[PDB]
Amino acid sequence: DPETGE
Amino acid sequence: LIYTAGGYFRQSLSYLEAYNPSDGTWLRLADLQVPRSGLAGCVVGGLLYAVGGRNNSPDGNTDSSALDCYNPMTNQWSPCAPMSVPRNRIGVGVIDGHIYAVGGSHGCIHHNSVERYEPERDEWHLVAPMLTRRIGVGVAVLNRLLYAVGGFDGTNRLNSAECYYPERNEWRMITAMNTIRSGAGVCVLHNCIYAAGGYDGQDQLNSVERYDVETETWTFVAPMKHRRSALGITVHQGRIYVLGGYDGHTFLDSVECYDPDTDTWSEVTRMTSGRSGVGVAVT
Description:
Chain B: It is found in: Cytoplasm; Nucleus. The complex is a heterodimer. By secondary structure, chain A is mostly loops. Chain A contains no helices and no strands. Chain B has one domain. Chain B has a 4-stranded antiparallel β-sheet, with no helix packed on it.
């Protein structure tokens, strides 16, 4: 996902 | 020192490390007792607490209800009572020795719920929910009021902020940030609420803005040299430290330091390894 890389 | 707990780098982590901004070197301390990313950290009575998050591993992806306490002169974690629900990408703040757990997600569910932890009683209590469902929400405490800032409601990323009044046990929308921010670093420096970086649904941000309660105004300040979301943030002796995060391509180990007097950022250290979604506090 773009936000956490997770 | 600045303690960083948990994080993510191909899997959730158990790391607890401490950085000394004077000497510049990193301590490696006791590992968390469940790998977590998307957690929050705070300090109450000198104790360091790890709240919520999830264990994203090769074998699972379990959202966390855990609250765990690290004692800095026992170098040992001990579990505390769990929360009513799991909260991945939670926000926390400290008022009057009490921990407030705000928002977060459990699977598909984006919480508006909020609960309060009582350290000397080890009990959680459900309190008034937010007006808004928020994960990746930044939380800050100013004048013993609790602010929930930005985040993501499941559909939209948010620039709104709302304020919780503990003696009314009530919420109130306030002025919205100039920037939509989810996964920002939210803290209180000098006497403003700072919001640093984050993700607006398109790009990780390097911009930074601060809220002045008396004028109900957000103003932009010195931007960081590196865009990042899901970063850790804390203030140490009057300067803002932002820690790791994700910029859409790599997991940052860069740690930046904002000087409020010069309105300038400068890179002071690299963490031991790049990671995002940590819990940070100072004790």
